[PDB]
DNA sequence: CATTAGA
DNA sequence: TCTAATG
């Protein structure tokens, strides 16, 4: 946790680029692992050799270990963080569209920057085409004072179409959080769940109503159950417009909310630690559901849910307000 | 890890 | 169809 921490931040930092400046897969998993277990080993790295002694631990990554204890840097890392073809790859990458295999084509093709990027908004699709235009706000974050603003008018439309919703803001935010990246809508309607047979128009109905009253103003992608785009808060009575923020908003069968809900809620480490003890708990837990398991090995057989309860009880623990998901 | 765009 | 990109 910080023992070991400049070998796994300098081994990331090398996982990393293999991975988007390379097309290393191997290589880039190889310094995962390793700056994986590295982490987890309870005494401080003196030397390779003694790093080494771990699993995914070869003479390659020993190599770079003593270079680095020995000396507080690594060429390799200093190399690098200093070539401007692979820096251009990491920049290009902020923009929300833009993926490695996009960075490195628009690289190659000399779009190393911003302004190259506007200079081609041609060579640019849709996605990138709105990413580009809402670069800077898509880098900021979301005063939760705004979370709840927007969170207010969003239920209010879904429930303006029809009242037969159900709509739950999830995420940090739903935590507590002071602060957030994009707003995420878990939705839900009676009329949908895990057999009938969809009704598409579910999430289209909602959409088309955000956007008929300008919450939702860019769409970057739109499917039948998952729609993800961009909104902004009604610019006052003047002089303050607000942020182009990104917005997802997605259909579940009423049958599946709450596991979904409790799930997309975290904090990442809540989850895996709850879900660890449904197992001890005799149960199973997973993104849509909870099953019981069978000593055989394994086992089948979704109980049913209607609240973030139904889950907790099952497992027989303490609800936990959203607040205290923390961990 | 599943959904969407796109070509 | 596959491949990329988001989460
Ligand atoms: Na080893
Ligand atoms: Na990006
Ligand atoms: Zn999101």
């Not at 700056?35 to 005494?43: E, N």
């Not at 057999?195 to 769409?219: C, G, M, R």
Request: glycine residues 6%; hydrophobic residues 30%.
């Amino acid at each position: 946790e910080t023992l070991n921490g400049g070998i796994t931040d300098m081994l990331t930092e090398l996982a990393n680029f293999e991975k988007n400046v390379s097309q290393a897969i191997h290589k880039y998993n190889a310094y995962r692992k390793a700056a994986s277990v590295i982490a987890k080993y309870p005494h401080k790295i003196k030397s390779g050799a003694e790093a080494k002694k771990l699993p995914g631990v070869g003479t390659k990554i020993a190599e770079k270990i003593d270079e680095f204890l020995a000396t507080g840097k690594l060429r390799k890392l200093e190399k690098i963080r200093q070539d401007d073809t692979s820096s251009s790859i990491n920049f290009l990458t902020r923009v929300s569209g833009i993926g490695p295999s996009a960075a490195r084509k628009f690289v190659d093709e000399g779009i190393k920057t911003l302004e190259d990027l506007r200079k081609n908004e041609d060579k640019l699709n849709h996605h990138q085409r709105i990413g580009l235009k809402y670069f800077g706000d898509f880098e900021k974050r979301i005063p939760r004072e705004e979370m709840l603003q927007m969170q207010d008018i969003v239920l209010n439309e879904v429930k303006k179409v029809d009242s037969e919703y159900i709509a739950t803001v999830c995420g940090s935010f739903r935590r507590g959080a002071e602060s957030s990246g994009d707003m995420d809508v878990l939705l839900t309607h009676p009329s949908f769940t895990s057999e009938s047979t969809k009704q598409p128009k579910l999430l289209h109905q909602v959409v088309e109503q955000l956007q008929k009253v300008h919450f939702i103003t860019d769409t970057l992608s739109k499917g039948e159950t998952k729609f993800m785009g961009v909104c902004q808060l009604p610019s006052k009575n003047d002089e303050k417009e607000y942020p182009h923020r990104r917005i997802d908003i997605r259909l579940i069968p009423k049958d599946q909310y709450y596991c979904g809900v409790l799930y997309f809620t975290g904090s990442d480490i809540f989850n895996k630690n709850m879900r660890a003890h449904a197992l001890e708990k005799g149960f199973t837990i997973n993104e849509y559901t909870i099953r019981p398991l069978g000593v055989t090995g394994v086992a089948g057989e979704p109980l049913p849910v209607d609240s973030e309860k139904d889950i907790f009880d099952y497992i027989q623990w303490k609800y936990r307000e959203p607040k205290d998901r923390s961990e």
